[PDB]
């Protein structure tokens, strides 16, 4: 009966809660009182990329951490040479309302998708010299919130239909579908080795998925609102989240629970994007307030601010070598920081 | 060789400029409304295009989405007007459509955006009224009907219309304005054209400090 099943669910939930609480002896801050603080960090705008006609929704760095792709709701994908600020490619998308883009780690393909529910893969390196769509991944039943290449043939997606999916790009079929969420899924992050990934959802819970087994290994629920942003720690054992409730939170995959919280009373706005710096000491965050903030991931002291945007900071990204940070914004410009 | 890449980038810039001109002068309309509403008449998003008097409209019939809107609706702060279509003759759903209109209008993000509200299917509404405020409403003579209309039809349809305008006026002081219409109808392009001209005019009045 439904009552008995739900009671068993609640007792299991309390077992999980008690295990996590028994593991929760110390705190990250309680240890890092002795850590030398980062102090102030100032980063200056080293570049500004001024091509996009409208609000920029996503950006992603190529693995050769110089090329960069960004998407804006005007229906354009642009690949930027982050050094010379040249536009390497400008791609007219079929659906104007693209909400995410990603760069293949081989650099051969970019993916983008949005309100059309289709993740389109574009071949950058055709012999004809133009950029053509390689494939369209149609199987989702909701807006695509995030995609991330695993490699030139496998891409994970997140959708408003509550499912994350793994795809075989050669065929275009879903290989395995990840379902356990209840609200619209908002962001992805592939583990460094790409065996696991974490997704954030409007149900304020974060989940850890097995790319191969296809099953939810863990669920995290600390936030009080929809999670807009999620990012893996560089070692792959912890991840940060960003929520409309103005807080970022660090969770540990081996402690199975929240490790740290990043908030300041002055911050009322929702977080739009998070990313770690290469060593993992700095946790950046994008906001509906136009400023992005830098958090000492261990101390939680707000080490700095990236002030140079005049609308919603919609996307953020650190280079693979950490030499720069990009941020896109609803003012339609991408600022590269260092 | 860098010079050749820069010439490529500047060719791309010229093409982007040629796009930006068409981006500015087109008007973007978000077309919302329940399943009952016959909004078709005038995979996800359908980005229909049309024009009036050399003004080109982009109408995004968002659809095939989970019933929640809170997230994907933030995309459309850039639109000139939401077009909200409601099938007036489905008396029972009409309260649900009313709450839907409330959720749109008082949406944190849409606060700037006017709503062109089509009270659709006037013909079925009339034929039903010939064959919902059953007790204590009568038409204010400030608005008068077209010839041939049974005053029962008029009083009913102006009751429904008032119900939406009531929500439109109880909040959103004057930042955005609901433009109700009755329709079935070849003129719906023209109604949109006129109400978009009016929305743009009011936006200018605000912007030019007039």
């Amino acid at each position: 009966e439904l009552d008995q099943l739900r009671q068993e669910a609640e007792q299991l939930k309390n077992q999980i809660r008690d295990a996590r609480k028994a593991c929760a002896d110390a705190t990250l801050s309680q240890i890092t009182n002795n850590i030398d603080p980062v102090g102030r960090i100032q980063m200056r705008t080293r570049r500004t990329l001024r091509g996009h006609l409208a609000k920029i929704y996503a950006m992603h760095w190529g693995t050769d951490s110089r090329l960069l792709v960004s998407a804006s709701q005007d229906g354009k994908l642009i690949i930027w040479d982050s050094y010379t600020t040249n536009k390497v490619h400008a791609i007219p998308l079929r659906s104007s309302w693209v909400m995410t883009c990603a760069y293949a780690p081989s650099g051969n393909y970019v993916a983008c998708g949005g309100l059309d529910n289709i993740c389109s893969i574009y071949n950058l390196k055709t012999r004809e010299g133009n950029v053509r769509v390689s494939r369209e991944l149609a199987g989702h039943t909701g807006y695509l919130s995030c995609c991330r290449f695993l490699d030139d043939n496998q891409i994970v997606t997140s959708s408003g239909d509550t499912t994350c999916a793994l795809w075989d790009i050669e065929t275009g079929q879903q290989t395995t579908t990840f379902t356990g969420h209840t609200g619209d899924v908002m962001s992805l992050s592939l583990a460094p080795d790409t065996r696991l990934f974490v997704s954030g959802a409007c149900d304020a819970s974060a989940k850890l998925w097995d790319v191969r087994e296809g099953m939810c290994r863990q669920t995290f629920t600390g936030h009080e609102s929809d999670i807009n942003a999620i990012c893996f720690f560089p070692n792959g054992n912890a991840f940060a989240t960003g929520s409309d409730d103005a807080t970022c939170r660090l969770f540990d995959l081996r402690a199975d629970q929240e490790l740290m919280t990043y908030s300041h009373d002055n911050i009322i706005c929702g977080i739009t994007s998070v990313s770690f710096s290469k060593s993992g000491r700095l946790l950046l965050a994008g906001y509906d307030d136009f400023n992005c903030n830098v958090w000492d991931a261990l101390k939680a002291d707000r080490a700095g601010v990236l002030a140079g945007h005049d609308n919603r900071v919609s996307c953020l990204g650190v280079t693979d070598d950490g030499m720069a940070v990009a941020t896109g914004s609803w003012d339609s410009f991408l600022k590269i920081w260092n | 060789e860098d010079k050749a890449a820069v010439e490529r980038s500047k060719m791309i810039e010229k093409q982007l400029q040629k796009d930006k001109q068409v981006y500015r002068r087109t008007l973007r309309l978000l077309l919302l409304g329940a399943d009952n509403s016959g909004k078709s008449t005038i995979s996800g998003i359908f980005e229909t295009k049309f024009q009036v008097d050399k003004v080109n409209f982009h109408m995004f019939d968002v659809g095939a989405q989970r019933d929640e809107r809170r997230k994907w609706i933030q995309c459309f702060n850039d639109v000139t007007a939401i077009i909200f279509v409601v099938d007036s003759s489905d008396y029972n759903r009409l309260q649900e459509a009313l709450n839907d209109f409330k959720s749109i209008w008082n949406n944190r993000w849409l606060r700037t955006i006017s709503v062109i509200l089509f009270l659709n299917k006037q013909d079925l509404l009339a034929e039903k009224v010939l064959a919902p405020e059953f007790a204590r409403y009568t038409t204010p003579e400030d608005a008068t009907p077209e010839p041939g209309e049974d005053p029962r039809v008029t009083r009913a349809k102006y009751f429904i219309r008032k119900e939406f305008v009531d929500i439109s006026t109880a909040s959103g002081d004057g930042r955005h304005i609901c433009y109700p219409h009755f329709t079935c109808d070849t003129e719906n392009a023209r109604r949109i054209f006129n109400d978009c001209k009016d929305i743009i005019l009011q936006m200018n009045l605000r912007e030019y400090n007039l």
Partner: single-chain antibody
Amino acid sequence: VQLVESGGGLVQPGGSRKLSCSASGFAFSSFGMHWVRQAPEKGLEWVAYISSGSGTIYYADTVKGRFTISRDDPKNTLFLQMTSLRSEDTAMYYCVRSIYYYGSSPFDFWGQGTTLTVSSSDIVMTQATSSVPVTPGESVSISCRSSKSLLHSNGNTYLYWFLQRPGQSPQLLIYRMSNLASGVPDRFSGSGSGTAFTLTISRLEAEDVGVYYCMQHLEYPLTFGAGTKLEL
């Protein structure tokens, strides 16, 4: 992808002739085109250039003023109007596409070429030997030297390697030092010190027989090294 050069034939000296090259199977408008020349049994020699969108045009000073390079993007065609042809101008003229952006492969594709018969302080590329006979399965290291450092301040070396098989147009082997072209087997390798460079064919096969040409792209009244032809 297919470039078909047309025009030429035989000209009385002092006449005029116009080459026409028709491109197909690629986005003609986005590629910068070059005309390259090869006098009979001689080396390759640059002739002209016209960037994408006709915004930039260059010429070899040998033909400056005499030759006009033009393109017709809507018709995917490349032209070369020749005004007063001298005996020197007798040669096969190859159309070449090149596209320049971060990571592109310029000169990657060459037309089949058309034959025309007629009745200082730049970079100079020197190739050590006319020929090298070697048996299949051996390794080879063709070498080149430049009068100027092709290592640019931006950190990449603008040396190119082309292989012209007997009776074929050249095909790009390495578009910048060590940047192996597309469609060529990993056997070919390249490196250099910024003034001297060597094309290492790691494990030779009978398919490699032909003439190897180096080419610079650092600063271009574009110029080629003389041919080195492998034998077996």
